[PDB]
Amino acid sequence: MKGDTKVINYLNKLLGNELVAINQYFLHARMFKNWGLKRLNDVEYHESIDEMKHADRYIERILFLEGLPNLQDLGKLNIGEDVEEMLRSDLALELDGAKNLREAIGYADSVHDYVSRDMMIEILRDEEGHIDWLETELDLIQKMGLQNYLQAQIRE
Amino acid sequence: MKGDTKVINYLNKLLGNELVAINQYFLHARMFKNWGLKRLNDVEYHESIDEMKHADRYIERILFLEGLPNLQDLGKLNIGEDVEEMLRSDLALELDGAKNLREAIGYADSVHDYVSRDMMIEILRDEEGHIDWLETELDLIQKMGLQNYLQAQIRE
Amino acid sequence: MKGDTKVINYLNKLLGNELVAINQYFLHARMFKNWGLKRLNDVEYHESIDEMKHADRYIERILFLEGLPNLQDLGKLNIGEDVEEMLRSDLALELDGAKNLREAIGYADSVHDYVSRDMMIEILRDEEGHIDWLETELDLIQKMGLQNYLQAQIRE
Amino acid sequence: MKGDTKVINYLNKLLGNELVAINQYFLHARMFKNWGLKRLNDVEYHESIDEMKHADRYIERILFLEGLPNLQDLGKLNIGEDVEEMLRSDLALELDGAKNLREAIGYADSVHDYVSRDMMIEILRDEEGHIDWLETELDLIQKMGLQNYLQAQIRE
Amino acid sequence: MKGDTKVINYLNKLLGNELVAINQYFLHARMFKNWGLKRLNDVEYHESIDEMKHADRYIERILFLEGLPNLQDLGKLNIGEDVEEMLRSDLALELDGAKNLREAIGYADSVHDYVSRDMMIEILRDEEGHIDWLETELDLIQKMGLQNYLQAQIRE
Amino acid sequence: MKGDTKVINYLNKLLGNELVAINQYFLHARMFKNWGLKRLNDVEYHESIDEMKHADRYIERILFLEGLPNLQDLGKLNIGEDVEEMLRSDLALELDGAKNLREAIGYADSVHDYVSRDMMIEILRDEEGHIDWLETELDLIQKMGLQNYLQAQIRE
Amino acid sequence: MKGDTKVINYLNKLLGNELVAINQYFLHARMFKNWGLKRLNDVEYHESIDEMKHADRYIERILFLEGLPNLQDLGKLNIGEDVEEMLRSDLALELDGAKNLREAIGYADSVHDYVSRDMMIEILRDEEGHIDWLETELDLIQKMGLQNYLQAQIRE
Ligand code: HEM
Ligand code: HEM
Ligand code: HEM
Ligand code: HEM
Ligand SMILES: [Fe+2]
Ligand SMILES: [Fe+2]
Ligand SMILES: [Fe+2]
Ligand SMILES: [Fe+2]
Numbered sequence A, B, C, D, E, F, G: 001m002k003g004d005t006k007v008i009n010y011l012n013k014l015l016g017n018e019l020v021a022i023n024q025y026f027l028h029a030r031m032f033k034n035w036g037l038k039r040l041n042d043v044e045y046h047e048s049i050d051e052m053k054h055a056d057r058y059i060e061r062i063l064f065l066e067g068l069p070n071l072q073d074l075g076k077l078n079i080g081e082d083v084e085e086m087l088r089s090d091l092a093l094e095l096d097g098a099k100n101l102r103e104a105i106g107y108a109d110s111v112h113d114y115v116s117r118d119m120m121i122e123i124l125r126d127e128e129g130h131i132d133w134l135e136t137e138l139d140l141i142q143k144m145g146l147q148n149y150l151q152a153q154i155r156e
């Protein structure tokens, strides 16, 4: 079915967000795993899979709407060198993605692409969960301190 | 069966206590859950259910004794902004409820409402358990310190 | 995540509706149970649980959006003294809640709070079911008469 | 296999009957369901499926006999506004269908289309069952009265 | 163990109440069964067993306290000739038994026979349940009318 | 609950679309089955059931909103005489239905009928799947040729 | 453990190959899926997972050897517009990756990084399998022709 061109660009832009998230989260995961922070590796790894599921949905949608998924361009990864910096970087990434999502959803509605919209709201709901998790973790670090926080990540 | 009027007022007053406890405990629970303090969310949530069971018992009793359960008036909730303050507030609530319970039990006995009395003693026994749990938690916070205490609530 | 302030007020107002519904439905339930109308006690009781689930969703959402859930203020309960009056009172309550819900949903959409919106539409769908059930019961009372209707509620 | 042309017209006419029955029964079903008359919704719904099975048999037969099933023309639905009127309308529909069936069966026999005939007799046997059920229900309404009859439909 | 003499007299008086209840309930049960009121036979029969359990408890207690259980004297049975009269008669019986129970419980407490007391409160709690059931049934008779009430007792 | 009149007309119009789809798909199915194209009979048959599920949803919704479902008027079926023509006709039908759906969804939103809207978006999502399937099949016919395509439909 | 710097660069380069393969294969997969070529979607999808497993191994290894995995730079994807072109593009990609792999393996051996070597030989063995599969598919296309080849991909 020929889709609205601007919806397709939005979908590709969103796809673009997912593919930075996929990599940044995956590297973070294995950084944590390396450091022995087993618990944070399990969670970030599973968020990486989450972003992959999202990318797949965009890809199938773009293809269905007869556009070209763009997996060629990769935005800026911001990796960071310690637990806090890296969680904080994932949070900024999620917050930017949510911003773009809110914009795309409004636009899909106004051209009547209600199923692209519905798919995007489901994704947003997931993003909002990722945001909840990062925010809580970052606060726990302050509340219990870094040393206690790290000890808490040792067993899955 | 027509009950003693003053027993009914006592039952309604006690019902009133349960309904503040229900709300205060439920909010506290989801405050803890939000903060990632998973363990305290499980316990307060289950105390919330406990207070609901109590309310139900009062309601069925009042109705049986042919009075009007009053779910309209809600006493003061005292929420508090951090773990200690909030546990401490639940403890004062429990202590006030126990006080009212002791009074009602004595009065039920003197008008021969032994089954209202028996029901109230069972509830009091539960309250006294809630009091035990709050007192222990509050002491643990001092003994192990706030940071260690918080780390201890992360996993259920 | 910091939410839109007006969405939070709406959420608290809706939460407020749920908490009157919870109490009014619960009392009605146990009034029916007392009268031996076993079937109406099962249904209203299960609607009470429904409204509790709703309240919980609002509470977690408000907390997530970083506002203060307000469980302190309780609107007017309208209890009523016989089956019809009481069903009819639940129906007016549901109709008012749906009205507020329609308003909040439109507003969430216009500030792009699509996940609050999505949650609210799911709740509205439940409310609309509660409305269907009340409307049908009230009509059955007229169609079959009050005596036959009551006999019909004796066994669950 | 090339069939007798007039058998095909009969088959299409009968198919036509089934397709009004399908719709009228389905709407009636969901009218009863809406009104809370759960028992009548189950039965009419299952008669709707029955008529669908019949239509399917006609369609496959027409196709086998190399004619064109006509699903384009739809006869008059007569819906009615209350339980009796609506049951009574289904009964007139069944009685008309049986009449057409008796005629087609006789004609199939005389051109030696014995398998069309055999299929039609099986269907007629079903119709005659639907007629039995409507007649009994209509009589029960008089014998027990409308109010008792309605109370009797509340549980499946 | 030698018990307080007056506690023993109370126990025998209460035993006396149970033995009228046993008979009156059993006859009522089989009267209902004869009349085809299957549901009321099941309930009254099970209340008969209940009163037997009570009598047994008194008998074992009296014997333990070294008194003589008196099964010789039987109070007045009041049977009645129709469903209402008979339910109403069971209710007056229960109300009289509860009165005697309240008196005995107070007295046991004041001579420190706390286990006799505890046993009596458990029994009272059962009586109060029997009272609830009779009161509800009697009200259902008025609310739904005698004919509908009787039809409602036909199947267990 | 009294619904918006124009939503009801839309619902009836959409219901109208479903009922042509139901018939056209069912006939197509049994045409394919007759021709031995077993695979296409399974799929179109299951799309027929899909459209039935849709019709049912409209019917229950209209009834709930207190309007009259219209199963009397049947739009134009366009049957076609060979596989391609017939698939292509189903595709035009789906495309027209999606158009009407997009319009109704926008309108439901603006009168705040969010649950009708939610139901319509779910249906649209299904339609969009039916469109995907038809488009793919039509392209496969060109890519692999008609003869290979037909051989491919012989086994389910 | 501090690794040899040049082994780390090789590992990152190889990682780089895997990440183009991951995307190109994933898009190809969903392109085939869209076109209904179900069989080719299953295989390319599973090759995508394969390349992901490879990337993960590089990432964990680089991290272990204390270097920085580079997921930021993405080489050229070459997508192509039809089945042959796209398979042929995957084959060129695999052939280039194998070339780099052969070079890295020889170099790891000469600095005594035998476990990086062992890991690389296992990966190479997988690549060589991917190459086998592409080569066979491309030949099947010529041997059986494009139309027969496409029909052959319709069912998984
Ligand atoms: C105020 C008077 C209330 C009464 C009398 C009441 C009564 C009850 C009862 C009897 C239960 C079942 C307990 C059991 O058998 O395990 C229950 C469950 C529950 N209640 Fe309430 N309730 C009240 C208010 C609330 C409130 C304000 C909330 C907060 C949202 C709430 C949340 C819940 C939840 C989440 C469940 C369990 C549902 C599940 O299975 O997931 N209740 N309630
Ligand atoms: C036009 C209004 C119709 C409505 C609202 C309707 C509704 C339904 C529904 C709800 C089902 C059950 C779906 C499920 O749970 O699997 C069903 C089944 C079915 N329908 Fe229809 N239907 C309609 C017309 C037709 C027509 C014209 C035919 C053609 C003969 C047909 C053929 C069938 C068949 C063969 C089944 C499966 C029954 C079985 O299990 O054997 N329907 N229908
Ligand atoms: C005088 C008229 C009475 C009648 C017609 C009667 C009838 C019955 C019947 C039919 C059973 C059930 C038998 C079975 O199926 O196993 C039963 C059980 C029993 N009866 Fe009686 N009974 C009478 C008096 C009493 C008395 C005075 C006592 C002394 C306390 C007594 C004690 C019991 C006990 C302990 C059971 C067993 C219940 C259980 O399963 O726990 N009954 N009775
Ligand atoms: C960038 C585009 C990518 C897409 C669209 C994608 C897609 C997927 C999907 C759909 C799954 C299976 C999830 C399910 O069960 O449904 C998966 C699994 C997986 N992915 Fe990705 N992926 C991508 C990139 C990556 C990257 C860069 C890595 C890093 C090495 C990676 C690592 C993994 C791993 C380790 C698994 C699971 C393997 C297992 O342990 O069973 N993926 N991917
Ligand atoms: Fe995402
Ligand atoms: Fe995310
Ligand atoms: Fe309590
Ligand atoms: Fe308590």
Ligand SMILES: [Fe+2]
Binding pocket: C018, C021, C050, C051, C054, C097, C123, C127
């Ligand atoms: Fe609600």
Ligand SMILES: [Fe+2]
Binding pocket: C021, C051, C094, C097, C126, C127, C130
């Ligand atoms: Fe509600």
Ligand SMILES: [Fe+2]
Binding pocket: D018, D021, D050, D051, D054, D097, D123, D127
């Ligand atoms: Fe039929």
Ligand SMILES: [Fe+2]
Binding pocket: D021, D051, D094, D097, D126, D127, D130
């Ligand atoms: Fe029929």
Ligand SMILES: [Fe+2]
Binding pocket: E018, E021, E050, E051, E054, E097, E123, E127
């Ligand atoms: Fe007793």
Ligand SMILES: [Fe+2]
Binding pocket: E021, E051, E094, E097, E126, E127, E130
């Ligand atoms: Fe008793």
Ligand SMILES: [Fe+2]
Binding pocket: F018, F021, F050, F051, F054, F097, F123, F127
């Ligand atoms: Fe449809």
Ligand SMILES: [Fe+2]
Binding pocket: F021, F051, F094, F097, F126, F127, F130
């Ligand atoms: Fe469709």
Ligand SMILES: [Fe+2]
Binding pocket: G018, G021, G050, G051, G054, G097, G123, G127
């Ligand atoms: Fe690879």
Ligand SMILES: [Fe+2]
Binding pocket: G021, G051, G094, G097, G126, G127, G130
């Ligand atoms: Fe490879």
